[model samples]
Target: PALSYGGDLDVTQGAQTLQDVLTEAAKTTNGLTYIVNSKNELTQSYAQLQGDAERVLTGLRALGLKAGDPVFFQFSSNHAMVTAFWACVLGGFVPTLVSAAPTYREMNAAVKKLHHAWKLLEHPLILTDDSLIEEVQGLAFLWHTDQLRVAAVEPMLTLERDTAAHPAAPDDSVFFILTSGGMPKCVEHSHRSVLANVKGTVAANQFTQEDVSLDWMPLDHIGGIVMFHLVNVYTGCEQIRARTDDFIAQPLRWLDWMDRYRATKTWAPNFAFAMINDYEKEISSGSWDLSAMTCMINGAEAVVPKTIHRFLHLLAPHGLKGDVIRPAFGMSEISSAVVFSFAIERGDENSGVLTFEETSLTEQLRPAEARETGTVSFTELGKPIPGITIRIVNHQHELLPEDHIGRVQIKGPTTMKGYYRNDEANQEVFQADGWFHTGDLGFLHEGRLTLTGREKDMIIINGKNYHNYEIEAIAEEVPGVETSFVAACSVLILFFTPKLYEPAYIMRASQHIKSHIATKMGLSASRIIPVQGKIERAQLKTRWQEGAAAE
Candidate 1:
């Protein structure tokens, strides 16, 4: 019989660390679908991934590589990227993974940024796929390459290599370096850092092996590799990498895949929610039922209350529960997920959703009972997961009292060790008290986290704070345009969609409507973002440090 997942959550005393989790996962399925690149060439199974790591690591050791040695791989998100990631973890080398570029402009900037990163750690091995061999090689020559060994993509070398059955130490640096918003610059991350991300995430959602995950988030980002890949592996869940191309061509694939796979769990950014909202017709036509999904982990970008609402309402007829739309907060600095809403009780209409619209707001100071939806809906990200401590503090570092707004600081096992080899950046993020400053702006509403958005993204007008996503959602409500289509879609699609004929003049008139929201609706400022490529539908707890790269 299926265990009742709605019972009181228990924090296991001896949850195996992340390293041990992956080590076991490697023994199960043989290289289970590592990368899904148009099916012509894709990696698979834990065993296959394990074998590939051995071959790559063996090849590198032949060149006198050692543990803790940073092995930089210049490949876009591909099967090779997956091989290199585990290869570094198993062999004790720090793998510095970067995004793939298809053009000279992007490639040059990517390589130059990598060169700046190399100036810090000086990685010995630079791995690349055949697609970008020329571009990566040219970039390598510009740097100090006396010991640089370039390994081309070869299946047999990676697939047939021998690997011993074991796991790395808990304190070992499994992976290293991440980009800030896919920035050219890189931030360092250790294995322990990643373990914190996966561990904390699993604990919050109370994930088990029975849960099936359908992931389309790219490998380079935390939502993809760390939260989705690593977390699914730890819980022994079946992870399906939904085709990215299919998701792009028809974003409904994300939801349809969930229904088809009966995927009870997944994550995406804010834009993903918007995509589902915009693509409701396609989703309605499908025969799938989303009600089985227990948790829709939202993070990697800002959470717009409207996006979640439309998702629930539009799919409500098909069994997508409002409570299952869990808004979470995570960052690469913590390997990804930090906090998520409490698990929903089956058959219960109300589980978790601390939106302002739900609250009566009788008291200006405190959050009231949740009603339907409102601005306060944007604030609550649920409570901190088990064994996690959250403190709201002001500029002086003193903890704030009830309803006081300040920087939400988190201190837990999940916080990443300081950035790799970058002391300045490390010092900027980590505090002397060991708390990782999330660099976000928010306050506690009856002990529930109410996010005000990123402090950096916050627009200060006459001493009041204004958020970006709220306005972005408003513009998105316009007709004809999508969120990724930042300008035209925000106006045309959202506003003019219902209009019989929006005179070209309405485009000019929407700005006035926006001004009214700022003046009358209490919104301070707004930025309309056109719907673009996957805007994270899930994985958007902390928006400051972990902003969406392009969409």
Candidate 2:
């Protein structure tokens, strides 16, 4: 085997094609079969998933889909989602998992992106379920009418295997993940990059077939698909994926389900933790058993120290470990987490690490006052995992010193070669040399990464990424609003200008705008304020700077 990107794991040891990775796991009996939702429970072992994949591949083959063809999957079921994902990898057809629009709020920003991506990918077959057929079918516009083609995978469920696995290499593109900047662009990952991501985390976590994992992150989020699903297959662990709607309906059931399944691993965003803490009473009533949970990845947004403290403290009585909260840092471009928190040893205080406290009365001793309040606490993101390398740089693209805030740049095997077919956008992110500039502002202290804020106006809520413009666009659609006068900041607060700010008019418009944001995106606007003049981003900038985005 030649040397691979991740120094820890080489590709030629036989996880070259994604199918090979699954084949290793399929040999074992432990698989993802305990799938749950609001309606009922569904079951599918890796062996079953494997059999279904070949059947799905048979359906694709009959459609004359060749190697390297793109197929978009829109399924409400996790069983359907992962089954097709395996089929795509085996068939050598590029697949991007698209969301099923439950709201039926036809042609929102997400649907537009899905439609736009379909055209960008040269009118690939859109594989969807019957329930989502109406919404998916309605996405085609007048201009796209000639190129639109949607297919149902239901009929192919009984099809026999009609093809063999495609001869794919580690460097070949495995699948596409949709991301937005100027617009939604598909980020492609190679088999080498995907396995590199899986290998590093698997080695670090020491995941095994005995481990049982549970998560409710949507299929689109990296935490849901890549971290919890794909990585589990590599490690040969049992995964129980829950429906997002059902989990949100009963947030406390997260704990109940974890205890029920004896889950050893899971991933949640800051908001999920906060929601659990929000209902302080409901937690104590449930029978709890979290002793098996060794890892709970908290990421995709700023990690709130208080939320972490609440979750652990609240459940520690029921056997949840204090250090199970692993602060993670990653993006779609890196496949998933490139850095996760490692436990730090406590020494009471770092007393003599700096020789002595300089504020001594005689330069010999000083009063050490550890305040209970009035200080900022940033969660340490440990260090880069395996092949990943992180460097903080300034506006000029020069490396900064430790503890100095700057742009966070990364270099690693898991990092994507480029966004699929978008060289102009890729050129902007991929710097000279191999570093990819993550548009986030952060700092490194003593070797750990800590994010301070963002260089871009984006808010990550519930582990899903949504840019400011999309939120602002939805706000502008409200009545009595001016064009290009709406702004959304890092704090998730919305600001807009009215044609005329009459008191009653202002109140009504603000209500309308807030409802629009909630309806359009699943996000709740912190506030909707009306202004008579142009809304300036610089003005919104001060509100966040004076108070941290979390505040």
Candidate 3:
């Protein structure tokens, strides 16, 4: 539609609303079913989901919920979550997904935003499970699923077939997804933008009813809800949903689940692959059958070559395809993937490129070099998908030439409508000319996008700029370091690990990392802090900055 690099997929074809998308899928016999393994193996087919949605909507209407009302739900079981979401969509009401923060500070911040969002709605309803009734006691217009399910079984109101189909203009808002952070803000997407990307995803991946998908990404994350769930709904494919906690506790279960279901498509971040490859020592070769898997997308975070190499090597004996390791780039605002790796001619090095290696970081663009010291690698996230356009711009907002590193800006139908009710934040991201500033630093070369780092994560050392990604990538190469447990902030690199060690071993590892960086980059870190257990990169940065200020 807007751009043609992603082939001739037309994104603006149908007048189907979000409700129509799922309802039609359910109409097909032997349609897809979702096998959700939270506490047990609970299966809900599209037909069952639609039936539950009808009952839920019937109950909501009896409670005076009309069109355009907003209903909030704390993401829980797949059955309950999908029921509430589809109910709101079918009833012409807005459905927003929210999560409960673990930390007290984060909970307070989330509540503040929730209060603000709640005040903006005409009739706001919050759906919670029985476990959260005490936590959400003070919230107004709350309905627990434990009670809602009972009403759903009874016929409180008459249901006509025509009443089930809710009309929605293409530009009408579909749902609100919060940004990723402690102080998260809501990002709104319209039916046109979301469906456009879903169409593009289906076209790019060649998805069909025969495909089966599996994933464990959190429902709040785009990779989980949009990419794996919503997009598959449009394609009418069976999707196995696993709990995030279970996957984290048993990393190899992701692979096992994929093989169990003979999944044709699945997606996860780089850290997930690395964890499964490195940490899962119990699984052996020929244990899982991945021959049926066509696409295993690596996205959401920086895509590292070593992680991909390890994953491929580990699964090779089990019939994992070489070209299945798909690298993609996406964000919440774009609905999902903006760019996904595409296969080309066999035996060509440039075919389905994964990452680009550069000689070194400098003021100007750098080219790829041999396997030499001081070289940096950036993941080549492929060209833009259908209806998407990407441009590189300098600090002054002027477009830059190919191979030049600058801010990554995007323009397309999939771009978000705007930040919900936050005009100040919207002005910062959405430009006047339709280009949305991504706030990421990267370069475009040979029609491929390579991300250097986030603009906020850049660090200066000895008058030279370095991204935290480069530093952490190098640190992670150290022996006994777990993937995704290293973070760089405030002139220091913090390493978190669960493996206990004597003081002597910790000291030796710290010195080794410090010496490695010094010999390689010729820059000395203030200190290498070794902490026990995992810490989120964003939270680590906030803690380090706060400590730096106090110092």
Candidate 4:
């Protein structure tokens, strides 16, 4: 009835790309409910979004913007963001989401990021609201360039509705997502990749138009825009969006909104789950009904079993399902999640978990059999979604036996083409024929995916990612801190060695390190421990980097 979804998915039904899917969905009654804040919300049908885009598209074309132009989007309002994004889509001007800041401190760094993108992407058109225009204006002053191509959406909407969805080739980029916000490690997602991901996700989860999904992950990230938003639209389902800031201020409101909107699907990383678990004393069963929630995606970071267990335990009385916790793995490169595990709570009860834990050692590793039992259950990464293939390989890139851990390699319909304009990166990661090195460590047991560790120099906290270089560079800015003697770990701790070991100076540096991280990245470092001056990158690599790898 609605094109092939589950049975060997295909992109047909007079649709070649996402623009068509959005067009078709616009005819349906289902739409998006945007939670702006406590007192207000705005619901818009797919048609409404399309109509808005059309009007904006007319305005854009009148200004001489056309296909192949990269338009950078910045918006405080979700409605404005989507409308502007869709307008770019219909006009065939490739769009990218840019993060904005409310404070001048963060705005300075934010402006630099836009300038970086401007240089790299060959002057991408900057689009945002009048409310954020001053911040966007910073881009103009940074390079002293008047032709930064910045535009405000308010004036664009006044034009007549005259544009329609552009017919994009399967290989055409629907959008570009810079994996690292400040760093332009851009990943261009084609129409095929997006549709394939949406099909696999929807078919694998069996999502339907009857479902209502809720999510608070930022639109800038792959998790929010493509994984959650685009995937739901494929099924013609309704989705609810809450402000990330609101969720940051009050994590419990995630559940409150889920209950209020009767959302059937939602997603958060382990960090948010841990956040909710902290307030268990306040989460009363009689007040919240999470029973309507069929899927609670736990991903964008490692899936912690204990966190998942306690989360289920916290809400068990409220009728949440054990299988509702869908621990998944994805990135901008792969479009979104291609592997997912359901019923984490049930797996633990079935003797999966041993640790009070453990993906790699457990090695030779006979690629252990999942019980019908296990001495331990690491959060299962589940199976590869339809049309996706995952394999473990040694450093040599030779495929490894299941349970014999090595590098995680992925090949799929949804896998991205390559990093933007970075041929060296493309050569390094992309092996051949869409087979790409995922830079992660994991193994498969009886066809189920289990992630072990990562080889990358990065860490994810509360679903946000930061590179060690950034952390180290930020810390090195402090006078007392030594260069090349800092390490940021997966545990969310920052370790630095001081050039001078004066206690007063070290203490000041420590506080400043913490403060700087928060100021620059909006992330709080849990610990800023001082390492000895004798420490070097090699050992720092061993203690923290290898420490995580070994763990």
Top candidate, metric TM-score: 4
Q: Which number leads on lDDT?
A: 4
Q: Residue 158 deviation, candidate 2, in Å? A: 0.7
- Candidate 1 Cα misplacement greater than 4 A, ranges: 1-19, 27-31, 34-43, 105-111, 138-149, 155-160, 164-167, 181-185, 243-246, 343-376, 458-551
Q: What is the full ranking by lDDT, best candidate first? A: 4, 2, 3, 1
lDDT of 3 by residue, 347-438 (tens): 34344443334323434555544354435555578878767788888767887777777888888888788887779998999886898888
Worst 10 residues of 3 by lDDT: 144-153
Query: How much is 255 displaced in model 4, in angstroms?
Result: 1.1
Better of 2 and 4 by lDDT: 4
What TM-score, to 2 decimals, does candidate 2 have? 0.77
lDDT of 2: 0.72
The residue ranges of model 4 lying beyond 4 angstroms of the native Cα positions read: 1-8, 12-14, 102-110, 346-362, 366-377, 457-551
| Of candidates 3 and 2, the better by TM-score | 2
> Residue 435 of candidate 3: its Cα lDDT?
86
lDDT of 2 by residue, 411-444 (tens): 8788876788888989989999898988986666
Candidate 2 collision pairs: none
Query: Per-model C-alpha lDDT, please?
Result: 0.61, 0.72, 0.68, 0.74
